[PDB]
Ligand SMILES: O=C(Nc1ccn(CC(F)(F)F)n1)c1nc(C2CC2)ccc1Nc1cncnc1
Ligand SMILES: [Mg+2]
């Protein structure tokens with residue numbers, strides 16, 4: 535119980551900030567995750583030997599893809615850590631445990647293809663689950679790793695509590711289906727504006743946790759411009775691979791996935807920021823006012839993409 539994790543001074547300061555980048559040293563990401571769980575939860579919540587074994591099985595089942603990789607996993611967990619630390623009274627001891635594991639696991643075994651490519655390709659996973667295809671896969675990968683010998687980080691919980699935390703995790707991982715985000719944000723907006731939003735209603739919590747997951751998942755659009763710019767090259771590399779695989783099936787891809795249309799990218803990001811990211815972080819700031827630095831950093835990047843369009847960079 536007396537084995538604290540420390541970080542170098544710059545990381546220890548900078549990790550509390552929403553805009554933190556976890557850096558290029560893979561070998562430090564686990565200790566970064568353990569440090570975040572230990573401060574977010576308490577040093578006790580997880581048996582350190584089990585956590586570490588769980589972290590490394592999770593790392594093993596992320597693939598070597600440009601964007602939806604191990605680094606994205608720990609990045610999305612860091613964003614959740616920032617949110618939880620700036621809203622510390624709002625969430626239960628179980629939610630804090632669950633949400634950081636959810637974020638770490640939310641993209642397990644991702645191959646860099648969307649749900650619609652799975653459907654067009656006729657992948658087996660699309661037969662198993664018609665909606666939220668990859669996301670139900672990501673959850674079942676989480677359950678798999680949890681059922682490996684010596685990996686049950688939730689062993690200490692009652693049957694009841696274990697069921698509650700697996701259901702937080704399932705809803706949280708499903709909520710990273712951006713198709714679901716649109717209605718979910720729409721309903722939260724309506725509930726907030728009419729003043730019916732009530733964080734004691736469990737179905738209202740679920741929605742707010744869903745919006746948090748979208749926010750954490752998109753958080754590469756809320757970093758400092760140089761990090762957002764380089765991370766965008768990563769997601770577009772998957773997009774263009776997927777477009778390539780669309781052409782292989784006899785299907786003209788949408789322009790966003792078409793690498794012959796690299797020129798359209800800056801205008802593509804305007805679209806994305808206006809239609810997804812700005813509305814996401816606006817609604818989140820309304821519900822959780824301490825999350826405002828994510829909205830501010832998102833607006834700055836939107837304005838950086840406008841400068842790109844106008845030849846100013
Ligand atoms: O850019 C993304 N999605 C786009 C682009 C164009 N459209 C069409 C539109 F605009 F209608 F939505 N959608 C994007 N998507 C995602 C996931 C939902 C797929 C995550 C990050 C993303 N971006 C990014 C930028 N910088 C640094 N990291 C990630
Ligand atoms: Mg995903």
Ligand SMILES: [Zn+2]
Pocket residue numbers: 602606610640641710751
């Ligand atoms: Zn993700």
